Design a protein around this ligand. Structure first.
Ligand code: B97
Ligand code: B97
Ligand code: B97
Ligand code: CL
Ligand code: CL
Ligand code: CL
Lengths: 283, 283, 283
């Protein structure tokens, strides 16, 4: 045996042949709304994304399918070509992410401590997800707090990356947008506020007072303004703080407290990161 | 439930797996010949159009499929990708239109009266067909006497529009060609001769002697030389003569008599309308 | 009935659903390696070509499928779209050519005579293969000793043409490359060495001493430097030496002896023909 996995089985049937669709809205991505649906055999809950059919959508779906095999990428189970209001659309059925957002979960931790080791485990997971994409020459280009979601409500749920609506084949810089995004997420993970305000990005006391240079040097190599200066995903995953995530110190962070204190500005933080990512895309 | 309808199930099998094909010719459209065939389960008679496979054909078929749902558009039941003389072709199976042409049927009415109310019912049907196409941003661009056919030999048969071989997506004027065509059909419906000879388009006595300004104003807004002046299909369907077609006066027309008198020139009338439409397309 | 044959049934499933794949290598073509596999129902041996998925591959496969029906073209049985190392590839399953190369078989004849009539039968077979391709406006563009293979180890096995990795639709010179290739093969068939060295192409004594002008005139019309001077495949197949291949004289050739004597340079002969064909392609 040699370990081929199935190609894109894009289906022509009406989805209602195979899935019961609902009007429960689960989310909105940058291309459109995400709806709940139920598999007509199993009753298992799934999520449906409606994309109006187009060459851009046909490429993006194919990239998400190629991404699907990675344990930290949201899996596609089915894709349909259907007619809706007489205009042709694509319906992507994905696995149900009832676990919510990465940082919203941390902000909802309350009592218990959020450690540098847990930040290392999360950042290893995110980096491991990007590593698969870059190794097959796919760049995500919209890695951000809205797009990192958990599979279940338990503490040991597994984090998966979402919304390939900006993804791009690097075949002949686009890959550097993911590495910048990883540095921003890692910064927010370690103190609860972002490295931007609209005169440097600071490392303010007290939150950073005991934080190592080892992480801060790792941050400095990710947040370079020039894309050519940023470390690659390969170099990131080989850093000891990432590679040896079990051995990382259990250092308590301020992150949860600060995210609660700044909760009224958190929507703005996510919006200006989206604006920064859009600026790096219209490049 | 939400009312999705099935996407283009283009089939790879040999059509003879599914349909018995015959050598009975039913017609010729602008792209090619139309043949009789029989569904191998049901024995129901259908019509087969052979299009040599091409990107232009692949788009046009998709537009005809999107059009198919409208009650006044000829339905596609199946589409096949086959090999013929070693060169790849597309076979479109459509519903059987044994009812013949719109004006040929009127010309064959003989005895009984053809009324302005019946012209309003026909023009409502044609306008209702175009309205669906324009509302999904499809323009037909070849609406003409050859392309409006009836489902059955009875008087109350339903009229359907045919031959998407010039149709075009208006997505970024093409839509105005259908509105010009509707005005020409409406003119011929009301007197039996066209508004062209090769010094105005007339409204000659006696045939127009009792014909209202309400229709003639409606005609004047459709036959404008500049496309930007023509009424839209929306404005046409809202005209009282169209909207209130049951209330339209039962005025007897000269149409059938004139079509019989001018039958020797009717082929030329259809040919010069095709030439006028081709001129408006090479635009 | 009208004799449609099935279109390209390109399949989405994992090939291992349908075929047991092996690590036995059968060959390498210009695009990639050819592997042995077994049909999971029948156990019949087949050959698998892995092409990384691309528009160029999607066209070439379609051309090979259209070619497939000809008895002297290697048949495709199935085509799959699969994922491999997370990158999308195409797997072409072809009929098993255990019979080896055209000239390698002749070189391995040893004892028995190789006749001008047998050279006429081989050249009729090759010309008959090209005739199908040109009649559907496909040019092969890499007809050469590596690409002409036999279906079985018996003397009366049937010769088939292979490797459509350079084939091209002539739709608007490319067709002339096949005719040049046929002339080179015919030359080598008749004496055992090629008409090139890197000052004319000779007809040396003794091998050509009794060879007719009828073949040599046929050769002269195929090896013209200017493509516009070469005979077409139609004119070739109408030549009496080809058309009347059963009536061709049983003249004994030197070919097998010379191929054995020059066996140490035969790999170079095939390589410089490939280089000449590449030069005629980068045109
Ligand atoms: C109880 C419960 C059940 C399901 C969900 C849920 C929410 C959002 C998504 C989802 C599954 C897939 C995708 S995909 C996708 C999503 C989502 N959200 C919008 C953006 C991030 N873009 C995307 O592509 N399942 C939440 N809670
Ligand atoms: C008894 C009997 C049985 C069948 C028919 C019949 C004639 C023409 C067509 C048809 C069905 C589809 C299409 S399509 C199409 C057609 C036709 N005609 C040519 C032009 C208008 N273009 C087209 O695409 N069925 C007439 N009489
Ligand atoms: C016992 C035994 C069993 C099988 C074979 C065998 C060798 C080469 C090929 C083949 C089938 C298809 C194709 S295709 C293709 C091939 C081959 N060879 C490489 C080049 C010519 N290009 C091509 O496309 N079967 C030889 N011996
Ligand atoms: Cl997506
Ligand atoms: Cl059509
Ligand atoms: Cl090939």
């Amino acid at each position: 045996q040699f370990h081929v996995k199935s190609g894109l089985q894009i289906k022509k049937n009406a989805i209602i042949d195979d899935y019961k669709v609902t009007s429960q809205v689960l989310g909105l991505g940058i291309n459109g709304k995400v709806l709940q649906i139920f598999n007509k055999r199993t009753q298992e809950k799934f999520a449906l994304k409606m994309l109006q059919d187009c060459p851009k959508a046909r490429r993006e779906v194919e990239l998400h399918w190629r991404a699907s095999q990675c344990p930290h990428i949201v899996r596609i189970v089915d894709v349909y070509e259907n007619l809706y209001a007489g205009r042709k659309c694509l319906l992507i059925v994905m696995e149900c992410l009832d676990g919510g957002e990465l940082f919203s979960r941390i902000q909802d931790r309350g009592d218990q401590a959020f450690t540098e080791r847990e930040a290392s485990e999360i950042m290893k997971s995110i980096g491991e997800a990007i590593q698969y994409l870059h190794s097959i020459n796919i760049a995500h280009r919209d890695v951000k707090p809205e797009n990192l979601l958990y599979t279940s409500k338990r503490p040991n749920a597994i984090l998966k990356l979402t919304d390939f609506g900006f993804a791009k084949e690097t075949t002949s810089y686009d890959k550097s947008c993911d590495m910048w995004s990883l540095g921003v997420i890692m910064y927010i993970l370690l103190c609860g506020y972002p490295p931007f305000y609209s005169g440097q990005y600071e490392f303010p006391n007290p939150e950073w007072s005991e934080v190592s240079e080892e992480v801060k040097m790792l941050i400095r190599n990710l947040l370079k303004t020039e894309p050519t200066q940023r470390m690659t995903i390969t170099e990131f995953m080989n850093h000891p703080w990432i590679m040896q995530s079990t051995k990382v110190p259990q250092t308590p962070l301020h992150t949860s407290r600060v995210l609660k204190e700044d909760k009224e500005r958190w929507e703005d933080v996510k919006e200006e990161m989206t604006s920064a990512l859009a600026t790096m895309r219209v490049d």
